[PDB]
Each structure stands twice: as C-alpha cells, then as structure tokens.
C-alpha cells in the first residue's frame, strides 16, 4: 500500500503583510482536494501528522536556529517582520514554528511506516518546505529541512550508516541538504536545479556540478544544473537517464527520498521550465525500481497551484502502481542540457564506474 500525510493545520502558516505571496496555505490544501478528486486520495492508507521534537530537529540544526525559530511563536507582528527580513526570502507568522514541526513530524511518520513495512511507499503534501534551511537558519520559504531530517530520523530507527538517497527535483537547489551531508557518504544528495551561471535564486554557486562533495562525502554530492534554455521532459528523462538513475543503481540506497517541489511544472510563476505531470510520473516511476520500492515523495515548492496539484497527483498515481501516462515525443533535448548532462557525467565518473 501506498501512504499519504496530510494536515490542514501545515495551512495555518502565512504571510500577513503579502497575503498573495507565492508560498500560499493552499498549495497543500489544492494537492490534497486533486487527490480526492482523482479518488487518489481512498485509494491511500492515511497516515497521522505529528509535531517533530525539539531532539528530532537538533539532527540537523544547532540549538541556536531551534531556539530563535521556535521564540517567532509568542511574537508580536512587528518582531515577526523583523525577524523574517533577517533572513534571505522568509516570512513568519505565530503558527510558523508548529507549522515547520508539523511538516518535518509528518514525514519522520512517514518514512517510519515506510521502513517498518507498513506501508511501501508515501507521498507528503507539506508546508513551509524544507530544502533551503541550513543547520544554522532559515532561506527560501524553509525554516528546518524536513527532507534532510527524516534522512537522520531514517537511519535513528534503522541502523546509522543507512543509506538514503535524496533526489531533489524542485527547479532550485537545495543548498540546505548539500550542506547538511556535505561530508557524509550514508546520505546520497542529487539535485536537479536551474542554475544560470550562479544567476537563479539561490544565487550560490555551490549549485554547480563541480561540488562532489568533501571528506568522506566525496562523490556522494550530484548537482545536475540548468543553464539557459527553458528544460522539460526530455531534459529530465536524459538526465535521470545518463546521471540519476545509474548513480542511484550503485550507490543501492536503503530508501529514497523525493524533494519533490513542482515548481520546474509546466505554468509555474517562478520556475520558467516545462516539466509535465506525465514527466514527474516517469520520474516517479524509474525511483521507484530502487531501495526496493521505498520511496517517500516530500512536497518542497511549486507555485502553480493547478500545475503541482496535477503534478503531485499523477506521482501518487504511480506509487499506487498505476501504469505510466504516455509522454510527448521526447523532442532532441536543448543543447545546454546536452553540456549540463557531460559536465557532471565527467565530474562523477571517477566517483561512479556507471558513469563511464
Ligand atoms: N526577488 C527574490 C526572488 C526569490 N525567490 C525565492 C524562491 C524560493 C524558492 C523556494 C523553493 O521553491 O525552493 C522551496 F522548495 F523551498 F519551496
Ligand atoms: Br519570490
Ligand atoms: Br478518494
Ligand atoms: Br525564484
Ligand atoms: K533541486
Ligand atoms: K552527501
Ligand atoms: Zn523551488
């Protein structure tokens, strides 16, 4: 069976001075309804959303960020502004805090249900999103990152050195979970990301192919980034093809987990690509030959609400072991991709006799 989490309480997060902010309430609450009228939604074995521990957080995060985050809740307005304007793109509200706890303990249940046998597999419709936060703040929309601690949570039950991919196929880099495991070699980080020569928020260029990793980690970092054109499809299923999946093959992790954000869809206001649902069910589809069918799928972004929820939807779809939709002919990918894609095949073959 398939797991799903969901909490209209994630919703109570918010934007008081910019209502129309992109990272809306309904982003989860559009998700979840798609899924019911799908009648996706049955077809799920729910699981329950619980408030991650302080303990649970202190995974990834020093007491420092825990203790300033967790102080936004008692906050008048003003400070919330204040503090908020602190960080690079966030904004806070008194049920932020909860919210964030709700999201990480959400998916912590998940990957437990997932790794007990419970369930096979899970999808996580989620907010504030995760990918962003670093061990000492907060970034991009994210204030603790729940994939990076349902990764330590993972091996907490398990055994330490369990190995756990994160695929993270939102259209921005996950700075936050590159650095998080940068030096780890138990916690395989791939991300997919528009890049633009360091241009594209977040404006690092830790986002480039060129960082493996370091330590003991070396090679067990995977940035595949985008430069130029408008990618989609077949962009992503010759990535996934040449670099994703050949790595995640060796590397055999234990389980899989998505940071799915949507927001390289079709529609999207930020992301500019064109991803189609189809393509995040053939994504879904090829994660799920790995870690014997364990896969935790982690809303991260995505601002079209029709275009994630439709999106999100059709990766459900394919955890519930539905047969893939049909993709458009894959056009000849753009030649920028082509670069992207022999720039990290030539950054890893050292690392991966895949990839050679
Ligand atoms: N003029 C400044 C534009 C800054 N834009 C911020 C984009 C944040 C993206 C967040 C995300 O989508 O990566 C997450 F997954 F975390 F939600
Ligand atoms: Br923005
Ligand atoms: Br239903
Ligand atoms: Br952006
Ligand atoms: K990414
Ligand atoms: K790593
Ligand atoms: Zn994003």
Redesign the pocket.
């Given at each position: 069976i398939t797991g799903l989490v969901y909490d209209q309480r994630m919703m109570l997060h918010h934007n008081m001075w910019d209502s129309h902010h992109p990272?809306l309430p309904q982003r989860i609450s559009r998700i979840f309804s798609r899924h019911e009228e799908l009648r996706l939604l049955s077809r799920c074995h729910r699981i329950p959303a619980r408030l991650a521990t302080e303990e649970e957080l202190a995974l990834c995060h020093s007491s420092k960020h825990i203790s300033i985050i967790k102080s936004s809740e008692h906050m008048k307005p003003r400070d919330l502004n204040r503090l908020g304007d602190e960080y690079n793109?966030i904004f806070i509200s008194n049920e932020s805090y909860t919210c964030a706890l709700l999201a990480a303990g959400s998916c912590f249940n998940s990957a437990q249900a997932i790794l007990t046998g419970q369930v096979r597999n899970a999808v996580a419709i989620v907010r504030?999103?995760?990918?962003?936060a670093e061990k000492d703040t907060a970034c991009?929309?994210?204030f603790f990152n729940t994939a990076a601690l349902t990764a330590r949570y993972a091996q907490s039950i398990t055994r330490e050195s369990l190995r756990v991919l994160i695929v993270d196929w939102?259209?921005?880099h996950?700075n936050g979970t590159q650095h998080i495991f940068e030096e780890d070699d138990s916690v395989l980080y791939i991300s997919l990301h528009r890049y633009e020569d360091g241009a594209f928020?977040?404006n690092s260029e830790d986002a480039n192919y060129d960082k493996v990793g370091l330590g003991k980690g070396r090679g067990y970092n995977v940035n595949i980034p985008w430069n130029g054109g408008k990618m989609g499809d077949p962009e992503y299923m010759a990535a996934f093809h040449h670099l994703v999946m050949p790595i995640a093959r060796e590397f055999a992790p234990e389980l899989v987990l998505v940071?799915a954000?949507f927001?390289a869809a079709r529609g999207d206001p930020?992301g500019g690509f064109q991803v189609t649902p189809e393509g995040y069910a053939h994504l879904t589809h090829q994660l799920m030959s790995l870690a014997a069918g364990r896969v935790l799928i982690i809303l991260?972004?995505?601002?079209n609400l029709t275009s994630i929820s439709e999106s999100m939807s059709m990766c459900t779809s394919m955890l519930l072991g539905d047969s893939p939709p049909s993709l458009d002919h894959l056009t000849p990918l753009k030649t920028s991709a082509t670069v992207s894609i022999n720039n990290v095949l030539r950054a890893h073959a050292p690392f991966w006799s895949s990839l050679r």
């Open positions: 990272e793109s504030p999103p995760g990918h962003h991009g929309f994210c939102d259209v921005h996950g928020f977040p940071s954000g927001d930020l991260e972004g995505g601002y």
